[PDB]
Amino acid sequence: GIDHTSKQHKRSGHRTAPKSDNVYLKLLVKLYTFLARRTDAPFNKVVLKALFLSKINRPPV
Amino acid sequence: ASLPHPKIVKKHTKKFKRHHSDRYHRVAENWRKQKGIDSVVRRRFRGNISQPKIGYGSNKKTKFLSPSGHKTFLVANVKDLETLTMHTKTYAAEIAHNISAKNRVVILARAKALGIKVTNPKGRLAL
Amino acid sequence: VEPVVVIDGKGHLVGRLASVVAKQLLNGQKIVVVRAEELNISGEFFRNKLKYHDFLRKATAFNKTRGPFHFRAPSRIFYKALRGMVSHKTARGKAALERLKVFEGIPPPYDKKKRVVVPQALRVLRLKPGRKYTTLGKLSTSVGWKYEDVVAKLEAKRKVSSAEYYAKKRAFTKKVASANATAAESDVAKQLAALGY
Amino acid sequence: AESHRLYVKGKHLSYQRSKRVNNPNVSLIKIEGVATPQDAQFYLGKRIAYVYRASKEVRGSKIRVMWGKVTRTHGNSGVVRATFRNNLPAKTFGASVRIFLYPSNI
Amino acid sequence: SAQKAPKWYPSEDVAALKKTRKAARPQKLRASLVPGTVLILLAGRFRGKRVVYLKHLEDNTLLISGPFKVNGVPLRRVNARYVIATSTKVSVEGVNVEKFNVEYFAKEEIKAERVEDQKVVDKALIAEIKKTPLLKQYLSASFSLKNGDKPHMLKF
RNA sequence: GAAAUUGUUGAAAGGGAAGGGCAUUUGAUCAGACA
RNA sequence: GGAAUACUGCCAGCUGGGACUGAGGACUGCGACGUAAGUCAAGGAUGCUGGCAUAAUGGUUAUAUGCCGCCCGUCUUGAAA
RNA sequence: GCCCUGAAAAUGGAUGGCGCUCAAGCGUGUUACCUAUACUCUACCGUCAGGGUUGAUAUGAUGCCCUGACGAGUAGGCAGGCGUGGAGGUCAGUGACGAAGCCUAGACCGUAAGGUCGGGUCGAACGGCCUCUAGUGCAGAUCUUGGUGGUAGUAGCAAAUA
RNA sequence: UUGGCGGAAAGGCCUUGGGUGCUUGCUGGCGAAUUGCAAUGUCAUUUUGCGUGGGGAUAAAUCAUUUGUAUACGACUUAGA
Ligand SMILES: [Cl-]
Ligand SMILES: [Cl-]
Ligand SMILES: [Cl-]
Ligand SMILES: [Mg+2]
Ligand SMILES: [Mg+2]
Ligand SMILES: [Mg+2]
Ligand SMILES: [Mg+2]
Ligand SMILES: [Mg+2]
Ligand SMILES: [Mg+2]
Ligand SMILES: [Mg+2]
Ligand SMILES: [Mg+2]
Ligand SMILES: [Mg+2]
Ligand SMILES: [Mg+2]
Ligand SMILES: [Mg+2]
Ligand SMILES: [Mg+2]
Ligand SMILES: [Mg+2]
Ligand SMILES: [Mg+2]
Ligand SMILES: [Mg+2]
Ligand SMILES: [Mg+2]
Ligand SMILES: [Mg+2]
Ligand SMILES: [Mg+2]
Ligand SMILES: [Mg+2]
Ligand SMILES: [Mg+2]
Ligand SMILES: [Mg+2]
Ligand SMILES: [Mg+2]
Ligand SMILES: [Mg+2]
Ligand SMILES: [Mg+2]
Ligand SMILES: [Mg+2]
Ligand SMILES: [Mg+2]
Ligand SMILES: [Mg+2]
């Protein structure tokens, strides 16, 4: 027995991929997944997360 | 004549039979989960049947492997038999139940030429 | 060690002996108990007589032939104490009880064999001196055992025959001892002594 | 001579068990002449065979064997624990077994 | 098609084994095993026989002789874990055992050379056995456990 | 031409129910590799 | 007055017997022993040998033995009732 | 302090049973020993988390791989899957040289929902995969309709003269 | 083979004579292997069946009938070459 301090098997609660099935959007995700892994530049990390956002989380500019 | 593999381990060989399927004819042996409030099986009392659970899952290395070390692939004619030409050490051909007797002769001859193992070569043999 | 062990029940406490015998039977040893009428029970005679009468009043109300059966013989009294220490309702328990025989007196088949004792169950080695005890022979008679005098007469006849046997055996032993002593003091005897024999 | 025995006589007592649950994978063995855990250390690792008879002859014999080994002592009275390739059957509680002198450290 | 073909197939090539670090080193026998020590055989055809230990072979086996003239046990190999070492010993100085090795017992009736060298080795042993009384009779008999004998208390 | 239910034949068990779980003995029966 | 021993604790002191386990799969790391080359118990078992190649192991099934197992569903604080 | 008197209830009876008296009882002290789905180490399944890897010439970057931790559950929520009738596409799929259905203490795969094969019976249609759709999965409701048991060769077949 | 004793379930114990096998009490001479480095390595006693030949002995019960000291039916009690 373990006296747990937090909930077990909890998901992170953040999207790790687009919900869309757009083939061209997945190519952009693959491109910036590679860049974020091997450039250590904060810009690439921000862009990769932004590509996962839903429609209401990407309002028009 | 398959690839070397670690010894195949079956965690639970016994079939999981539905509770009281041996007590009433109307209750089939296909596994069903008890959902009653008082059920001793659901509450897991000592001396009762075991229930399926993910802990019994077999090793992924030896999963789906026949005792001969091959994976089973259903084959209907010569064309789909030839898809196993380069994979004779991992897959074995099984002839479908609804193939006529004469067509089975053709498939067995081609499999022998290609070195492909057949798991049911005695089906519909007019010996 | 022996294929059959014959225990002389004289001077043994019923419960202590029954516990020892029950374990031996479950371990696969055949046991024969003789002279069950000379068994002892701790406590005075009146106290143990009251205990049996408490057992007597227990019976199935609607049919007495179904209730507990009250056996009066000394051999059966010891059998009751023994059966309570065995899971007699199982096949394993039934098999163990088939390797046991209990007799009053020493019947002819076993009167010419060797008898042993169980020190853990002996009254003279267990009870504090001065404590009262009862003999199973007199307790059985007071509760309806009809064959006390018959056993006593047969036992007296057996002891006369056994005493005559011992007289011949004792005289033969003296002759053997004299020959061994004379055969000592020789070279072969000297070598045996150095090796402990 | 009249004796040809090279093993030590033993008895199969029961399985390892609690008050109400038993464990058939471990058997308790009583070895004659052994009454102390210190003495039972001599027999640790020794091979054990249970010999029984059958009506049907299979490999040119009507005598069958089940092989085992002594693993550890048990209690204060010289009993030992033994494991067998196939678990001994429960009907052999009280049956004789043979404890061989090999493998030997003498 | 009776079954849809899988998109992926496992590789048919076998992988090489990693380099193992397990170097073979010579066996050390228990101190009771000394050439010339009388041994008791516990298993095999000649179980219960009393033989003479001669040489330690390179396959972790012990070369023994009856001698054949005394008890009918010829030159054989035995496993060290299947024998009992006794306290009695016979001198081996004067016995030539260099020619006997692992290859001499290749498995591949009785050969003539096995008969001849059995007599050569036994002749030296028999002379040493005659030095002490009852040793020849002792090696002719067979060992057996009697009633009441406790092996954990007996000293050999 | 299914099941409940029934007859015949064959096998097995049965000292106030039957059926079940873990383990092994016995009987019957069976696949896999002989590279 | 001089020792011994008991008790408690420490050793990067030595050594015998028994049981369970062998996951991984080219190389890469950290160390040890060595003037050197190299070796090693250093990021997970190898070497040698025998019998059998079939119902022998094993699976299935029936039965026997040890221990264990109350009838499911439902309402309910609480059901074998 | 222990023991005894004070101490009377209805079927036969319960320190769990046997039984136990320098205890196998009561108070107390010291050790050895027995065994939980708990603890320690290892393997395997799954879940979650943190990471590595697009470079062609070989197939899944929802891929492969490295590291650590975790796993009870009614009411209830969510996720990944199994099976059924019908629909679009595809396998130039199976079949009177035997399709479907049914029987089979015969074999194989899956933790499971299930899937596959052999044998028997049988006679005309049917399946895999990618998708669409629903009158889509039963042990119960004094459930509906139909069929069949134990009871049981049993109750009984005795008013009105023969 | 001679004799005696034993009835609690005696079914056993003791004793007399001769024939015969062995004797490790002591001293000799031949034989063993290859089951290959272990594998119960098979040496006990339960029941029963079929064929050989050496002796031994040549019946009852039930149904049916009958009786009423009996009786729901079975059962019981009687008779019948
Ligand atoms: Cl059982
Ligand atoms: Cl599945
Ligand atoms: Cl009548
Ligand atoms: Mg299965
Ligand atoms: Mg509840
Ligand atoms: Mg389940
Ligand atoms: Mg009376
Ligand atoms: Mg019809
Ligand atoms: Mg039917
Ligand atoms: Mg088996
Ligand atoms: Mg059982
Ligand atoms: Mg039982
Ligand atoms: Mg119970
Ligand atoms: Mg209420
Ligand atoms: Mg309920
Ligand atoms: Mg105390
Ligand atoms: Mg645990
Ligand atoms: Mg947990
Ligand atoms: Mg859970
Ligand atoms: Mg068909
Ligand atoms: Mg069926
Ligand atoms: Mg038609
Ligand atoms: Mg509906
Ligand atoms: Mg229904
Ligand atoms: Mg329901
Ligand atoms: Mg109804
Ligand atoms: Mg009527
Ligand atoms: Mg009637
Ligand atoms: Mg009427
Ligand atoms: Mg009328």
Side-chain angles (χ1 to χ4, degrees):
Chain A
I2 300 171
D3 187 14
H4 296 289
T5 63
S6 61
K7 190 177 306 302
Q8 299 298 289
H9 304 122
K10 179 64 172 182
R11 293 180 294 271
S12 69
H14 306 100
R15 272 154 80 140
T16 61
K19 196 65 153 56
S20 179
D21 294 320
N22 191 334
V23 59
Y24 299 106
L25 181 58
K26 294 171 183 177
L27 295 178
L28 289 168
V29 171
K30 182 166 60 177
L31 172 61
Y32 273 91
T33 301
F34 178 79
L35 286 174
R37 178 165 52 88
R38 289 180 63 185
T39 53
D40 53 80
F43 175 85
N44 296 128
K45 296 287 180 54
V46 175
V47 173
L48 176 61
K49 288 172 57 180
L51 290 172
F52 303 156
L53 291 174
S54 64
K55 188 181 181 180
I56 65 162
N57 291 119
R58 312 181 324 265
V61 174
Chain B
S2 61
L3 252 65
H5 58 275
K7 188 174 65 64
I8 304 178
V9 173
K10 309 290 187 178
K11 291 178 176 178
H12 193 100
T13 64
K14 184 190 177 67
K15 185 71 62 171
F16 289 93
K17 294 178 179 179
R18 180 176 176 184
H19 185 62
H20 278 177
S21 64
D22 50 71
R23 185 180 181 94
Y24 304 103
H25 180 93
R26 65 180 182 265
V27 178
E29 293 188 357
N30 309 59
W31 172 252
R32 292 299 185 271
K33 177 82 170 180
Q34 294 298 321
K35 313 206 179 55
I37 55 183
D38 293 325
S39 171
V40 292
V41 177
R42 184 188 68 77
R43 296 155 77 184
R44 298 193 292 254
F45 279 90
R46 188 178 71 192
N48 290 109
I49 61 176
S50 295
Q51 297 173 301
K53 52 178 58 185
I54 201 59
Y56 291 110
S58 64
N59 192 330
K60 290 186 296 299
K61 300 300 199 306
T62 58
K63 202 172 190 293
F64 301 111
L65 290 188
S66 292
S68 65
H70 300 262
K71 295 183 185 300
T72 302
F73 180 77
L74 200 61
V75 151
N77 52 46
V78 175
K79 183 168 182 296
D80 49 65
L81 169 71
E82 296 181 348
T83 64
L84 305 177
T85 304
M86 309 297 299
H87 318 282
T88 63
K89 291 186 177 300
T90 51
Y91 285 81
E94 185 172 49
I95 299 183
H97 79 288
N98 56 341
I99 308 302
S100 65
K102 55 177 181 181
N103 285 325
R104 291 174 189 256
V105 178
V106 179
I107 299 178
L108 289 182
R110 195 71 180 102
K112 182 180 178 61
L114 295 176
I116 302 176
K117 182 189 185 302
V118 183
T119 65
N120 56 336
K122 300 180 185 62
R124 298 195 189 188
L125 277 189
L127 182 138
Chain C
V1 183
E2 294 181 335
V4 181
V5 180
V6 183
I7 303 174
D8 184 17
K10 176 174 179 295
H12 288 73
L13 306 176
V14 165
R16 306 263 173 178
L17 180 63
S19 183
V20 175
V21 174
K23 194 58 179 182
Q24 291 293 141
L25 271 303
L26 291 165
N27 287 359
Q29 179 67 56
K30 295 187 182 62
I31 298 295
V32 174
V33 185
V34 297
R35 292 210 290 178
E37 74 285 346
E38 286 284 63
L39 280 166
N40 295 127
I41 308 179
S42 60
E44 68 173 0
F45 171 82
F46 199 96
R47 177 166 187 82
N48 282 116
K49 183 170 176 56
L50 287 177
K51 287 187 176 184
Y52 196 92
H53 284 284
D54 294 0
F55 174 51
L56 270 177
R57 70 174 66 110
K58 292 165 175 48
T60 292
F62 59 95
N63 188 2
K64 262 67 177 180
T65 63
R66 297 173 173 267
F69 297 138
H70 312 84
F71 288 80
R72 320 302 169 99
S75 64
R76 295 291 95 187
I77 290 181
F78 175 72
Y79 184 86
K80 178 184 182 298
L82 214 158
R83 198 188 73 175
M85 306 176 188
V86 169
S87 184
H88 62 88
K89 291 182 177 178
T90 59
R92 174 175 176 260
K94 289 176 171 61
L97 293 178
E98 292 302 319
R99 316 180 179 105
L100 169 80
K101 292 184 178 64
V102 187
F103 301 101
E104 284 107 5
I106 316 191
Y110 307 100
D111 60 13
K112 290 181 175 60
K113 298 294 174 55
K114 181 67 164 63
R115 278 84 69 174
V116 304
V117 296
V118 181
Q120 291 172 357
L122 284 172
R123 169 185 57 87
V124 76
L125 296 187
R126 290 299 306 182
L127 289 189
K128 185 183 183 65
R131 294 303 184 188
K132 298 298 188 297
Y133 61 93
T134 179
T135 310
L136 199 56
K138 52 183 174 64
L139 173 61
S140 283
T141 304
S142 64
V143 301
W145 180 51
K146 306 174 183 179
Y147 305 113
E148 193 204 48
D149 294 331
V150 180
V151 171
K153 178 201 64 177
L154 293 177
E155 278 293 306
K157 187 179 62 178
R158 181 189 63 84
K159 293 177 183 181
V160 173
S161 301
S162 178
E164 293 178 359
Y165 160 78
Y166 177 75
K168 277 78 170 185
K169 186 166 178 290
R170 201 202 309 108
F172 175 73
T173 297
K174 180 175 58 178
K175 184 179 305 304
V176 175
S178 295
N180 288 119
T182 298
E185 210 73 16
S186 62
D187 183 71
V188 180
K190 291 284 189 174
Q191 304 176 53
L192 281 173
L195 300 170
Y197 288 83
Chain D
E2 56 187 6
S3 58
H4 306 90
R5 183 167 55 85
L6 293 179
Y7 57 87
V8 183
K9 303 175 181 178
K11 287 294 184 179
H12 181 208
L13 305 176
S14 62
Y15 301 140
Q16 181 186 27
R17 62 177 292 170
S18 65
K19 194 188 301 292
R20 259 96 179 192
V21 186
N22 62 6
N23 181 28
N25 293 122
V26 175
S27 292
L28 305 178
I29 302 296
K30 174 61 178 60
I31 309 175
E32 62 165 10
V34 182
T36 293
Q38 282 72 36
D39 293 353
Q41 286 281 325
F42 178 87
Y43 301 87
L44 298 189
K46 292 298 186 299
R47 301 298 306 183
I48 303 186
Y50 174 66
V51 184
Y52 61 104
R53 296 181 179 269
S55 299
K56 187 174 66 177
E57 175 173 344
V58 173
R59 291 290 186 166
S61 177
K62 292 183 184 298
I63 300 174
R64 305 179 187 183
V65 190
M66 301 180 76
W67 282 103
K69 55 195 298 178
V70 184
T71 62
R72 51 182 289 180
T73 64
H74 187 78
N76 289 328
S77 298
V79 181
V80 302
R81 307 185 192 181
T83 61
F84 288 76
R85 180 191 185 272
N86 283 14
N87 296 326
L88 290 182
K91 72 179 184 182
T92 60
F93 294 157
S96 301
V97 299
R98 307 180 186 180
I99 294 92
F100 289 98
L101 299 175
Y102 54 85
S104 173
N105 199 43
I106 295 181
Chain E
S1 183
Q3 180 178 348
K4 177 59 61 180
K7 284 83 60 176
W8 169 258
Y9 292 97
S11 179
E12 290 280 63
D13 293 321
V14 291
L17 292 80
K18 294 171 66 67
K19 297 309 184 64
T20 316
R21 305 173 179 176
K22 299 292 175 185
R25 286 178 286 272
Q27 172 194 13
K28 44 186 59 180
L29 296 168
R30 55 188 181 272
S32 56
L33 288 175
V34 177
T37 301
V38 175
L39 302 185
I40 301 178
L41 306 185
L42 296 173
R45 187 221 189 111
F46 300 106
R47 52 184 177 269
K49 292 284 188 176
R50 297 183 174 101
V51 300
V52 176
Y53 172 46
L54 295 177
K55 188 184 181 181
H56 185 19
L57 295 184
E58 297 297 328
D59 59 350
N60 295 6
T61 59
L62 277 63
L63 177 60
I64 57 153
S65 63
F68 183 86
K69 183 57 181 177
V70 176
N71 54 18
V73 180
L75 289 169
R76 299 185 71 260
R77 301 184 292 178
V78 291
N79 192 19
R81 301 304 295 270
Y82 288 80
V83 298
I84 301 291
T86 66
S87 178
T88 170
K89 186 178 301 179
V90 297
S91 178
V92 212
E93 286 72 12
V95 186
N96 186 278
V97 215
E98 189 65 27
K99 65 182 305 304
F100 307 99
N101 51 23
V102 177
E103 177 61 31
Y104 183 81
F105 300 98
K107 177 63 170 301
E108 66 88 10
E109 296 79 23
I110 179 64
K111 292 182 295 182
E113 54 93 6
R114 282 212 179 189
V115 180
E116 289 299 330
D117 54 16
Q118 179 72 51
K119 300 175 182 176
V120 180
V121 63
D122 284 2
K123 191 266 300 181
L125 270 71
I126 290 179
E128 304 290 338
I129 295 177
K130 292 174 59 66
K131 300 292 181 55
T132 162
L134 294 176
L135 182 62
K136 182 185 182 65
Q137 289 73 16
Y138 175 73
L139 301 180
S140 305
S142 292
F143 170 79
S144 184
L145 294 174
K146 306 298 183 302
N147 289 335
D149 293 0
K150 285 178 279 294
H152 64 276
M153 299 300 300
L154 291 179
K155 279 176 285 184
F156 297 91

